[PDB]
């Protein structure tokens with residue numbers, strides 16, 4: 176098996192699972208971003224599912240300032256999450 | 272247990288599976304990158320497993336010019352792969 180190839184497949188399909196619900200089918204608007212985070216990455220925002228948190232996230236992800244998250248911005252986001260997971264790979268911050 | 276979260280875990284674990292083999296345990300050298308690409312992402316390089324292909328790949332990934340690929344650089348690489356896969360999601364080039 177090639178788990179990494181299957182992982183990349185899931186990263187692509189999961190974006191479209193939500194991005195195609197409304198409007199531009201290649202970008203996540205606020206509504207679609209909320210659904211994606213809540214259903215697919217619940218560990219990221221955890222308890223922070225209020226509007227202030229979602230607007231902060233949209234602002235952080237939306238690098239080109241078009242009010243939506245496109246595939247490239249979404250991969251930067253996932254890469255950020257992966258970098259944070261990577262810090263705890265040993266079950267403690269091996270760094271110090 | 273959410274599939275996207277599992278995908279991120281695979282991204283993380285697969286880097287360490289190879290980066291820890293030689294030298295700096297947190298970066299991929301040429302030999303480690305070859306094994307990773309070959310065993311885990313064989314569809315990427317396809318038939319281009321020659322020395323010239325690997326040198327070009329290493330210089331493309333190693334954006335800080337330290338001769339190895341760190342986890343951040345590896346996430347940029349995986350993101351590039353996903354972006355390329357994503358271009359074909361509709362079954363035709365949906366672009367301009």
Ligand SMILES: [Ca+2]
Pocket residue numbers: 193194195196197198199200201202203204207
């Ligand atoms: Ca949309």
Ligand SMILES: [Ca+2]
Pocket residue numbers: 236237238239240241242243244245248
């Ligand atoms: Ca945007």
Ligand SMILES: [Ca+2]
Pocket residue numbers: 289290291292293294295296297298299300303
């Ligand atoms: Ca190494």
Ligand SMILES: [Ca+2]
Pocket residue numbers: 332333334335336337338339340341344
């Ligand atoms: Ca480097």
